[PDB]
Symmetry: D2
Subunit: 248 residues, 4 copies
Amino acid sequence: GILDNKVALVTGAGSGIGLAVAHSYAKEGAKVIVSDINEDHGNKAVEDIKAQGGEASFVKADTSNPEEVEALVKRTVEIYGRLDIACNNAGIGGEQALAGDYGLDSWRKVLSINLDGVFYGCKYELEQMEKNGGGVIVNMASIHGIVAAPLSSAYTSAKHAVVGLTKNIGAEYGQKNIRCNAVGPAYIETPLLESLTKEMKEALISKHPMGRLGKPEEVAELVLFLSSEKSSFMTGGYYLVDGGYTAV
Amino acid sequence: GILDNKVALVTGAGSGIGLAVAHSYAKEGAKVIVSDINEDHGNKAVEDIKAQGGEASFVKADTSNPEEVEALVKRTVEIYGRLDIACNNAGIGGEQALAGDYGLDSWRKVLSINLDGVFYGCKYELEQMEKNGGGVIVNMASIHGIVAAPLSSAYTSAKHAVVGLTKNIGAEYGQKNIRCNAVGPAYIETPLLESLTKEMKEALISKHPMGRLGKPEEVAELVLFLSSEKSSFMTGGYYLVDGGYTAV
Amino acid sequence: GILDNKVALVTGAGSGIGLAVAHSYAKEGAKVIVSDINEDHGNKAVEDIKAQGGEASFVKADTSNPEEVEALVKRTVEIYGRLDIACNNAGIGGEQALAGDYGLDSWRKVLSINLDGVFYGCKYELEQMEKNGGGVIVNMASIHGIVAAPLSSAYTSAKHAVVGLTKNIGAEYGQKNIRCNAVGPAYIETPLLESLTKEMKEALISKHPMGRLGKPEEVAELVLFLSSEKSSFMTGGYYLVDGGYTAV
Amino acid sequence: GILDNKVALVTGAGSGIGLAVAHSYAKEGAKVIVSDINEDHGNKAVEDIKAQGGEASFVKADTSNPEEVEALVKRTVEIYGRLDIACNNAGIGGEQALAGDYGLDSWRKVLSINLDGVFYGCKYELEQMEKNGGGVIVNMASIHGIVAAPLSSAYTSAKHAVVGLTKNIGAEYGQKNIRCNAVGPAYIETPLLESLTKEMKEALISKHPMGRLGKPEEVAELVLFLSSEKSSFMTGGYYLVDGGYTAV
């Protein structure tokens, strides 16, 4: 596999996109730290990856706490000796409300996880990668890092910020054997989204020129590509996996 | 004056861009609340505006504190009866350091002021605007809302987030007689740039195809246009005043 | 007016946006060369301009012919002595078809008028402006200079090209007292729209967060801004007048 | 092999990026049609591909001639039965001059190859892919599909149009089992660049945060990814391989 001998960290890897990323990375021979705030989801993920022949180990962390993220990376190096690859994926949707109605605490919660937690990841990841000869970071953005999601101004702002942070890191670290890029998924099938009224699901689908929602594995293939040597001249970029959503 | 009997609020209005915007608004007949964290600067601006034939009043605020921002909009309505226009301009540059070395506190501070404070302003501005038949908001972003500034990853992130927030507000309030746009200046000549050496100044200048830095008045002109009825079909947009910087 | 004694050229100024731009420029004191492929429309526009106190002259030109555009600019200099401002507005929409079905001749025709004609304009405009101390160009793009219009691939491709051209010119001429920017209108009201049933108007309206189409005068207001000294530090940029269309 | 039994067309495949794409496609099991205007280069690429163990054939074509492009696709179908993948790569750099000094012929020649040839390619490719249950197209753009290249306005304009064409095709064909994306390389090592002086090469390198030029293989890996089923939820997008160039 293309990540043989590499150590990879994934945040929010207990479900959806993060899990699919943890699976891809393990399937290509990485030793994967599965991180999540939820221990049940985290352990199930490690057992499923072990079951299918991979090396994974679970480390609990809330990305909005910088001490827990520093401790995650520290533990990664304890369990596996190094850090080569990180996907900063943990995120929340947040309250839905018009910006003028948007809660103060709800705003801060979304920004602390979706932005600050990504920044904390990057910071301790970069610190480690400089000790072990470099590495590659993938930041999970969204189509909402470039276009609005009405009623989700916090999410949008946080995802835009992630894009900007990615550009900064890719530029700053270009000659330091570190790459950093962002991925921008549109709407992706998860159990939550199957709950919607058929007409609401069809309204969302009609925003994607491909005429369906994405699958977590389709995001994960892009993440894998940007985390491997195949993307060796790619850095500071934002990469859509959007079904055409932003083309119109 | 194209803003006759409008009431305008400007944050960080004591110096630089904010001061020029406050002047331009007053020159066009607006009643202006000059807000700044610094009372001497703010009071000085109000006198200068009044000396030139305009109407203005000073209200102290730290935009990172949501209570102070709510109080500012309140006080605007107490003094002039309504809020028609707002320019969310207060910001800081922040620590300059590699993202891996960037301070946790320095990161929070830049994001607090440059993003949360803009959000707080927009939140309380929108709330009032819906009570007085709508209005117009201009958010001060930067070229760094779309391109990196090496060593200023917090600043970049925050300004990207401002561009996102703007798109969201413009999208959400499209049918509510409220417009919201963002301005992206490049580097602007202010007395605070006479602590650059000759070589550091020429280096900044060489990044602008126009071969000079911008003036605060030239940024204010764009703010003015975006705040008036002349820009009636412009909302959610990002508008460069960059001397060519981002064309290459 | 703000354009007092400037000499301004507008292509395709017999109808819609160009007409509004020609009115705006003339209302603000410019000497306006009205150009169009239709003599009746053109002369009609010049007479209409003069009826409100304006100075204008008609000059026929087909912008797909470089010789005609070069002679258009010679003729402008003959009539008014110089060229200060040019708006390259002349366009067509082309046939509606899937890219795979798109006519070879229709592709050619759209690119020839909407791109080559803009290039011709800029080439011969720049030549003359370097003889007379500089000046300002505005190129008419569209939202479809940055997002797709399904079934109108030629139009989209040409307007994308116009944005790229504009960046090049802004950057190339930044120290030669020449500015060049591009305007991106969304969908605009035309005479025909009033004739349609409710459902046919509302079709486009729903893609604009502002809940209406734009008026040609609202586009001309941004073109005027970008044509005057008010925008003196703006060059190489793309400027939306889109009602929020591209924010989502 | 990830393209096993797929039929892949590459234009301008005699050298540089196109040659690397053809090698990558063939290595992954595709039956490759190498197209080039130069027979000697084309035949040599086929021999080199066959020598590694791949399947390929040469079809001569000038992409600026739409009949030749039609015939190229017809011939691909005669040789290998179908068309699944196409990479529209043939391009030229064109004359270097200020926009106001740019030759009329040079402009047309650059646009004819860089844009029109890409459209002709997509036209006849889409026409065939609709007969054989779909396919995937990659259009070669450049960093200059989004940022200017002073003295190369025709190139910039044409690559911008490619980006727009791509968005259109991805949007239009989304539910028709056809994907279309564009690739945006920065400066890539070629014999030409290699020769150009130590001082100029350094100046160009220093515009890339990664501190080197790209290799054609590095571009090809992104093309391969975008042509494979791994990118199944990616369409209408623009994908950088720029070493960080556009991040600042």
